[PDB]
Amino acid sequence: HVGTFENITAAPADPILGLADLFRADERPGKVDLGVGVYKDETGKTPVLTSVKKAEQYLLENETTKTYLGLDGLPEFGRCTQELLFGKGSALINDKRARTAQTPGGSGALRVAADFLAKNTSVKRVWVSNPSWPNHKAIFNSAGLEVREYAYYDAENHTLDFDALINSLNEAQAGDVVLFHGCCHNPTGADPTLEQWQTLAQLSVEKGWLPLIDIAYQGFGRGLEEDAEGLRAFAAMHKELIVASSCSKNFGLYNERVGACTLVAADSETVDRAFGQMKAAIRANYSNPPAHGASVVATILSNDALRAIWEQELTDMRQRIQRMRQLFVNTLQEKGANRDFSFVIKQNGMFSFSGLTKEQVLRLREEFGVYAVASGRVNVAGMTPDNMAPLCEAIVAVL
Amino acid sequence: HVGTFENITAAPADPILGLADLFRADERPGKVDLGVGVYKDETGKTPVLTSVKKAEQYLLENETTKTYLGLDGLPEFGRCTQELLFGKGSALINDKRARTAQTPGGSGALRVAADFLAKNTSVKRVWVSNPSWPNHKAIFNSAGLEVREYAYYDAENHTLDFDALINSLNEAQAGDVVLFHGCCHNPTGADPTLEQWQTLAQLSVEKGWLPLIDIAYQGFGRGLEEDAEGLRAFAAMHKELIVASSCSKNFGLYNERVGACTLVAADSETVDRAFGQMKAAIRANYSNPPAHGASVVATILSNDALRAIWEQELTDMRQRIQRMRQLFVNTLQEKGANRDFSFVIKQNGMFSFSGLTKEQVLRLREEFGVYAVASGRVNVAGMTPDNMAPLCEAIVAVL
């Protein structure tokens, strides 16, 4: 009998992993990795937040069981998540129109949403932005859902081409899902203004789309509340929506897999009915979600002092990112960049498209030891006041 | 337009939660919960193990980042898992034939295995015992795989009807997956002898089944090494295996979602191809597995002192369960039970089928506050020296 695994085709090499290997083997002292996918501080570290360490100590000292939680996880974490998303006192929460399942990361939430939609609704198609966050397609396709892209970023002029966006969405049908990044669009950093969000929300009601908001950077754009404005504009106008939220970045809890899938429906009866089926989707997957990270988040958010420490940590991250954005632009100008990069200070979060070609990206790595991903996406948190001049000189040299 | 969620039909109520609800509302003091699905100690608690607390303290002190690891999780956890499953000096390990992805519990492992099989192999069918763990069907069905049942337990006579088992498996085709519980069959507690495992292993090679060993109770039957005998009998004889392992029960890490999916193939290059695609299945699901529980397990197993503590704790759990089995039988006899329950003494792990009718189970609950599941499955870890007499008196009264 031939082996069941004998003829499996190798998965394509991960170009990201390959760059990471090359980088760690690179012995040049001047090397700089702008391709990284997580936050880094000024020293190049991705530390455990102090608020998280404190919460973990509290759990160490107080947890008396690790017995299974329900399929939807820790109720307190669900409540905290809904408040972050919709605001405390939200009419939506008061009307009991939202149900939240804690999931292993926003990634887990996206897959749970995908499986739930596939098994219980007529949704066939999910629309995502161009450029897309690479992982959306794999997740939705895995559940049997088609993924299509709508117009979003004007790469030549470095803008969110809103008119192109709206027009391209005319192709989306009632009952399709349209996925928007809540804030800090990954990878462009180009977000709708509030007016644009309101226009999108109205359009979604007129066209009958089911909005899915992927929000993994609440707090990295302009602030916690500001960053939720778009989501809330949608929540105000829609009877239904899905939110896949993450605490990986804003709590620095990446590997603990802390996020949630929130369902909103027209009324309590409907959302409860839907949620029962979402729980079934969870039962057929990983059964119940990992407690530690969600416990940490609930612990931080349900304590005034810890929460304040965390909010400052988040503000510090946001502001370092903004500083690097401004310093990048100014240093490019100082180094004689032959064109303007002001778009960088108009963009939110750790990622922007540099506008560099793949050839320029290659040249940057080979000649200058400056690493970016093929798309030209750079993580400004990979920049520091000490590495900024040489990396900008390098960029100017390849323009 | 409206409601994508409006036409969703209600999930059937799950009687488990229903029974938990009933139990919770039951204010009677004599309550005995034999329906629970986790280990409980003599005081009726599901504690965090001391070895685990020590490991968590060490992590708090030493961890400096929670940045994403690979989709396969923590390498050291993978290695320790493999060593537990296959033993020191395993030729299989020496030949580099195994790869392990840390997953969110054995449940996550089973789903990942299912998705990996569905997307990359010709497996159409997974065979499970009658009865088996209730979630197997949902998990495999979710991935598009049919689930079929093989004969296993003779409920009238309280035996693993091995001849019935073997014959029923003649229907399993080459390339089908056949799932066996590694030890402490859930829910019967009836395990194959080593000779029976060897017979199954040989049959499996002859018939070309892909064995999937679901092992969630290693150490609860006869001991760590003994409980792996079955798995190892399969490993000795097979070019390919999948193991879904869990640390939920033997480390008391239930809600941290610590388990693994281990692929074994004919050789290193083959298992690498398979493993790459398993990683893709993970990427389309929850992406990274949750670090905390796996870090705990790796910390314990890679330290001689901590490991020795953990093994003693595991022995204590195993031995308590065995003592309750013995005590249950002796107490029923002394209480004049109108029949023999001696089958309970030889069964392995925390579960047995009591043989009580649903009428008797209902009466047990309504009249005596003794809670079993409708199937008559009892969790003997729900028994204690203190509750044993009234428990057995209630049972005698309903016989």
UniProtKB/Swiss-Prot annotation, chains A, B:
It holds the Pfam family Aminotran_1_2. Has been used to construct a 2,4,6-trinitrotoluene (TNT) biosensor strain. Its EC number is 2.6.1.1. Changing residue 283 to V: Reduces first-order rate constant over 25000-fold. GO terms for molecular function: identical protein binding; L-aspartate:2-oxoglutarate aminotransferase activity; L-tyrosine-2-oxoglutarate transaminase activity; protein homodimerization activity; pyridoxal phosphate binding. GO terms for cellular component: cytoplasm; cytosol. The keyword Aminoacyl-tRNA synthetase does not apply. Its cofactor is pyridoxal 5'-phosphate. One of its GO terms (biological process) is L-phenylalanine biosynthetic process. Keywords: Aminotransferase, Cytoplasm, Pyridoxal phosphate, Transferase. Changing residue 377 to A: Reduces first-order rate constant about 10000-fold. It is found in: Cytoplasm. The keyword Transferase applies. InterPro entries: Aminotransferase_I/II_large, Asp_trans, NHTrfase_class1_PyrdxlP-BS, PyrdxlP-dep_Trfase, PyrdxlP-dep_Trfase_major, PyrdxlP-dep_Trfase_small. Homodimer. Belongs to the class-I pyridoxal-phosphate-dependent aminotransferase family. This is Aspartate aminotransferase. The gene is aspC.
